[PDB]
């Protein structure tokens, strides 16, 4: 149904925006761990 | 960077609003006995 995409749309954008703002800081943490 | 007393006041202000909205919905719409 279409209502699922409507509800999950802000969730996806929120997660996406958060990734790109933390990605350069996130993968460095995994560099250091590995 | 952002003063902690400001973050606490804003969050607190947000609590009173969302709580007040619930008490508002007690007299209107569903569960209002009207």
């Amino acid at each position: 149904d279409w209502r699922v995409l409507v509800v999950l749309l802000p969730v996806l954008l929120a997660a996406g925006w958060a990734v790109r703002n933390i990605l350069p800081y996130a993968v460095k943490q995994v560099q250091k761990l590995l | 960077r952002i003063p902690l007393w400001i973050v606490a006041t804003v969050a607190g202000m947000g609590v009173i609003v969302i709580v007040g909205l619930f008490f508002y919905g007690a007299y209107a719409g569903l569960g209002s006995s009207l």
Partner: protein
């Protein structure tokens, strides 16, 4: 007490990068929840009756489950007579 090692909550919620991320994520989750109700998706997911979906036009008889194993079809036949 000392400190376990994780980053102190105080400095994180006072950091800019945090509120750069969470001025978008937090309202989006709020809106997402709003859309979950305003679209009426919540009603169909959990099977919660709408204000016009408790009775038919002339019944006060409660659609109460009386059987154990044929309870699923017993609820479905309740939804049908609406």
């Amino acid at each position: 007490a000392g400190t376990t090692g994780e980053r102190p909550f105080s400095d994180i919620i006072t950091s800019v990068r945090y509120w750069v991320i969470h001025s978008i994520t937090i309202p989006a989750l709020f809106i997402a929840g709003w859309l979950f109700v305003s679209t009426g998706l919540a009603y169909d997911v959990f099977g919660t009756p709408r204000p016009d979906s408790y009775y038919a036009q002339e019944q006060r008889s409660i659609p109460l489950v009386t059987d154990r194993f044929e309870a699923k079809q017993q609820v479905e036949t309740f939804l049908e007579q609406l």
